[PDB]
DNA sequence: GAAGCCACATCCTCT
DNA sequence: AGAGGATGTGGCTTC
């Protein structure tokens, strides 16, 4: 809980949180590190475990079917919003295009210090 | 199919459904009849708009002419009416000079489109 | 039929060319999902060619416009004002030879424009028609 | 309350 | 693995 992640992209409890803004919080908590991280390059992350990702995102959605070719699926509809792209060749490895660092307050070099990744 | 009357003495066009969902195919394939001669390979073109989208986004638009009809692959319409307003429809046949033919409250287009009561 | 016979009555009666035949706003139609930039390039590159397609805003009516009577100088002048466009197209609008008559600032991609009916056209017109 | 707008959730086809 | 088309669904807002 480094940062209010959620809270600093926009989601106010006002409907459903989105998905990018799920993906931030997990991204916040130390916790998480283990299914989900930042690859160490700017806003660029890595779901190391979909399948956790999933099921997360699914129980926060209450969706309890809900699997990472779904999830995906919603990654991909961010790729003409220009929030989320993909990073070609490496496997589960997307990255935030939008302006995170004006939402978030802090520069990835600072984030990536406050939740110590390596 | 069943034609129907345009605000051209000289045009006829297939009719089109009330309401329909914006970026989704069309129930019945769009075309235009010309009641006078008009020489095969004439395109002809759809655009729309009205109060509150001075022009809408089609897709599709445009098609040739072959003996009087001129029938539109797969027209779709992008731009939204707007809540209960409909689209005037603008089809050109270019001859020379161009013809042009409207259709007023042709077609209502929405995010959702017609759906069940909830 | 090609046109209506009462073709100059429709111009002055029917409301549709009423409410198109006083200074209506236009407004340049082509690639709204483009840059301002190329918007601009596009609209006068093609003008140049001899069309466009302008709708008029307030009635949201749209037309793809054809300089040319029945390249120009006449139905298309950048001269007559730094900045501006004088275009002008003829057509046979729901059965009735009109002309357009606008201009449109070639930076903002907008201008005011309205139509008049065609006397010359509309007659002969009638002829064939018989 | 209907009727809009949204962001998915689901399912699929193709490479 | 991943891109993207088609279409249904529930949250919320506006007329």
Same mark, same amino acid.
């Given at each position: 809980?480094?940062?209010? *992640?959620?809270?600093?992209?926009?989601?106010?409890?006002?409907?459903?949180?989105?998905?990018?803004?799920?993906?931030?919080?997990?991204?916040?908590?130390?916790?998480?590190?283990?299914?989900?991280?930042?690859?160490?390059?700017?806003?660029? &992350?890595?779901?190391?475990?979909?399948?956790?990702?999933?099921?997360?995102?699914?129980?926060?959605?209450?969706?309890?079917?809900?699997?990472?070719?779904?999830?995906?699926?919603?990654?991909?509809?961010?790729?003409?919003?220009?929030?989320?792209?993909?990073? *070609?060749?490496?496997?589960?490895?997307?990255? &935030?295009?939008?302006?995170?660092?004006?939402?978030?307050?802090?520069?990835?070099?600072?984030?990536? *210090?406050?939740?110590?990744?390596? | 199919?069943?034609? =129907?009357?345009?605000?051209?003495?000289?045009?006829?066009?297939?009719?089109?459904?009330?309401?329909?969902?914006?970026?989704?195919?069309?129930?019945?394939?769009?075309?235009?009849?010309?009641?006078?001669?008009?020489?095969?390979? /004439?395109? =002809?073109?759809?655009?729309?708009?009205?109060?509150?989208?001075?022009?809408?986004?089609?897709?599709?638009?445009?098609?040739?002419?072959?003996?009087?009809?001129?029938?539109?692959?797969?027209?779709?319409?992008?731009?939204?009416?707007?809540?209960?307003?409909?689209?005037?429809?603008?089809? /050109?046949?270019?001859?020379?000079?161009?013809? =042009?033919?409207?259709?007023?409250?042709?077609?209502?287009? /929405?995010?959702?489109?017609?759906?069940?009561?909830? | 039929?090609?046109?209506?016979?009462?073709?100059?009555? +429709?111009?002055?009666?029917?409301?549709?060319?009423?409410? $198109?035949?006083?200074?209506?706003?236009?407004?340049?139609?082509?690639?709204?999902?483009?840059?301002?930039?190329?918007?601009?390039?596009?609209?006068?590159?093609?003008?140049?060619?001899?069309?466009?397609?302008?709708?008029?805003?307030?009635?949201?009516?749209?037309?793809?416009?054809?300089?040319?009577?029945?390249?120009?100088?006449?139905?298309?002048? $950048?001269?007559?004002?730094?900045? +501006?466009?004088? $275009?002008?197209?003829?057509?046979?609008?729901?059965?009735?030879?009109?002309?357009?008559?606008?201009?449109?600032?070639?930076?903002? $991609?907008?201008?005011?424009?309205?139509?008049?009916?065609?006397?010359?056209?509309?007659?002969?017109?009638?002829?064939?028609?018989?």
């Amino acid at each position: 809980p480094v940062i209010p *992640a959620a809270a600093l992209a926009g989601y106010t409890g006002s409907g459903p949180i989105q998905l990018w803004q799920f993906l931030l919080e997990l991204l916040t908590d130390k916790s998480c590190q283990s299914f989900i991280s930042w690859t160490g390059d700017g806003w660029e &992350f890595k779901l190391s475990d979909p399948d956790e990702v999933a099921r997360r995102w699914g129980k926060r959605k209450n969706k309890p079917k809900m699997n990472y070719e779904k999830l995906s699926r919603g990654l991909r509809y961010y790729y003409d919003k220009n929030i989320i792209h993909k990073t *070609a060749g490496k496997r589960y490895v997307y990255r &935030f295009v939008c302006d995170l660092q004006s939402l978030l307050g802090y520069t990835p070099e600072e984030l990536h *210090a406050m939740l110590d990744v390596k | 199919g069943e034609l =129907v009357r345009t605000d051209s003495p000289n045009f006829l066009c297939s009719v089109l459904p009330t309401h329909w969902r914006c970026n989704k195919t069309l129930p019945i394939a769009f075309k235009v009849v010309a009641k006078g001669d008009v020489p095969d390979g /004439t395109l =002809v073109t759809v655009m729309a708009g009205n109060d509150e989208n001075y022009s809408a986004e089609l897709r599709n638009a445009t098609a040739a002419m072959k003996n009087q009809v001129a029938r539109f692959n797969d027209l779709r319409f992008v731009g939204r009416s707007g809540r209960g307003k409909s689209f005037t429809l603008t089809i /050109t046949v270019f001859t020379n000079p161009p013809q =042009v033919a409207t259709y007023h409250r042709a077609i209502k287009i /929405t995010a959702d489109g017609p759906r069940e009561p909830r | 039929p090609r046109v209506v016979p009462d073709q100059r009555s +429709k111009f002055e009666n029917e409301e549709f060319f009423r409410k $198109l035949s006083r200074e209506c706003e236009i407004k340049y139609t082509g690639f709204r999902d483009r840059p301002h930039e190329e918007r601009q390039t596009r609209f006068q590159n093609a003008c140049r060619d001899g069309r466009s397609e302008i709708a008029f805003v307030a009635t949201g009516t749209n037309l793809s416009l054809q300089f040319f009577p029945a390249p120009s100088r006449e139905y298309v002048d $950048l001269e007559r004002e730094a900045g +501006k466009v004088y $275009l002008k197209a003829p057509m046979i609008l729901n059965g009735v030879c009109v002309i357009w008559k606008g201009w449109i600032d070639l930076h903002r $991609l907008d201008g005011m424009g309205c139509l008049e009916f065609d006397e010359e056209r509309a007659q002969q017109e009638d002829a064939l028609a018989q």
